[PDB]
Write a protein that binds this ligand. Structure first.
Ligand SMILES: *[C@@H]1O[C@H](CO)[C@@H](O[C@@H]2O[C@H](CO)[C@@H](O[C@@H]3O[C@H](CO[C@H]4O[C@H](CO)[C@@H](O)[C@H](O)[C@@H]4O)[C@@H](O)[C@H](O[C@H]4O[C@H](CO[C@H]5O[C@H](CO)[C@@H](O)[C@H](O)[C@@H]5O)[C@@H](O)[C@H](O)[C@@H]4O[C@H]4O[C@H](CO)[C@@H](O)[C@H](O)[C@@H]4O)[C@@H]3O)[C@H](O)[C@H]2NC(C)=O)[C@H](O)[C@H]1NC(C)=O
Length: 319
């Protein structure tokens, strides 16, 4: 019994967790990350991003990404590979370049081909393009969008497909999990990629939610079905539910209800293949350093002890 065994019993492919290389030297941490009752899938939190894999142009660095793949491979866990094209965690040579459409397109395609070719056969899915939308659903004015225009999105997908025809190609974003301008625009990215004749298999819903402000199970399910109706699969890719500190029994209970609704929405949607939490212990959560006054976002606490959210997840997975 555990999150992943429970998820597979309801026809999900996995329940999984992100991690990061610095944490792999923590033996108690790695023992629980390697617990396949709870985790059947791993995402590298940083070591397959552009700054990590191509720190100088045409100079590729795969050791840290390969370390996470090797752990998943030893444990029998699926990989989600993350992420090819993103405005954040670009190396200096991308962000500082004097580019034409032609020279940035060649550099983007070369990044994708090299990284996807290296990981061919290793990934369940790639987050091909990450966070291409503004909160109003217009295109984020990244260097890719400014220099190439909207075509950079389907071109990224087509370039990934050519290098690895089998991996599921996902568009990944946050604040697309509930009805609004951004979710509508994420549907429209699915439609645009297919209009270009390029392949998109999945929508990745980050699910960085807030305790007591989490969308209802019903609102989440409506949005999941809105994507699956377009002939793609879906997954919750980076689930965490950040609480206004300090922690209280009431906030931990609300967090449990919030997590339970996310898992239950996925279980209720044919085509929702799985849930990945953005790491699993509060000790290593990205949240407190980014969201002032927020924290304690995960189903285990900073001592690797289960919080009520672990039970809420198990209930939402119908265990
Ligand atoms: C850098 O270099 C690259 C590589 O050379 C350049 O790539 C080109 O980029 C073009 C877009 O900038 C892209 O055009 C698109 O092609 C796809 C696929 O079209 C083919 O297949 C379809 C379907 O079978 C067929 O109908 C076509 O005839 C083609 O055979 C189209 O889906 C796209 O269509 C959308 O956009 C056009 C153009 O929209 C702009 O201009 C209009 C009118 O002036 C304006 O109203 C609009 O707001 C835009 O400013 C529309 O006319 C279409 O109706 C489509 O619009 C829908 O979809 C958009 C999203 O894609 C929505 O934003 C829009 O509201 C609406 O819902 C489009 O024609 C080329 O395929 C691509 N070429 C290659 C070789 O990859 C790149 O431009 C260049 N960048 C720069 C900055 O120079």
């Amino acid at each position: 019994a555990g999150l992943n065994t429970a998820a597979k019993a309801k026809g999900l492919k996995y329940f999984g967790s992100a991690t990061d290389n610095p944490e792999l030297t923590d033996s108690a941490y790695v023992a629980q990350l390697s617990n396949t009752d709870d985790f059947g899938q791993i995402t590298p939190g940083n070591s397959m991003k552009w700054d990590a894999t191509e720190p100088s142009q045409n100079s590729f660095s795969f050791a840290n990404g390969d370390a996470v793949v090797n752990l998943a491979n030893k444990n029998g866990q699926l990989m989600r590979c993350h992420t090819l094209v993103w405005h954040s965690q670009l190396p200096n040579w991308v962000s500082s370049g004097s580019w034409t459409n032609a020279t940035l397109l060649a550099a983007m395609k070369n990044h994708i081909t090299n990284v996807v070719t290296h990981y061919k056969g290793k990934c369940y899915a790639w987050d091909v393009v990450n966070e291409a939308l503004n909160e109003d659903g217009t295109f984020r004015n990244s260097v890719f969008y400014q220099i190439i225009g909207p075509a950079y999105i389907p071109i990224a997908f087509a370039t990934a497909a050519a290098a690895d025809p089998d991996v599921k190609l996902y568009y990944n974003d946050y604040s697309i999990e509930y009805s609004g301008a951004k979710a509508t625009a994420a549907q429209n990215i699915v439609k645009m990629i297919k209009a270009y004749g390029a392949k998109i298999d999945g929508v990745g819903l980050q699910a960085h939610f807030i305790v007591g402000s989490t969308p209802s199970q019903s609102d989440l399910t409506t949005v999941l079905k809105g994507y699956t109706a377009l002939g793609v699969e879906v997954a919750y890719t980076e689930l965490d539910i950040r609480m206004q500190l300090p922690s209280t029994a009431a906030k931990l209970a609300q967090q449990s209800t919030d997590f339970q609704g996310v898992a239950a929405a996925c279980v209720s949607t044919t085509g929702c293949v799985g849930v990945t939490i953005w790491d699993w212990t509060d000790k290593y959560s990205w949240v407190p350093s980014v969201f002032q006054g927020y924290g304690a976002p995960l189903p285990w606490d900073e001592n690797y002890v289960k919080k009520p959210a672990y039970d809420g997840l198990m209930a939402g997975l119908g265990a």
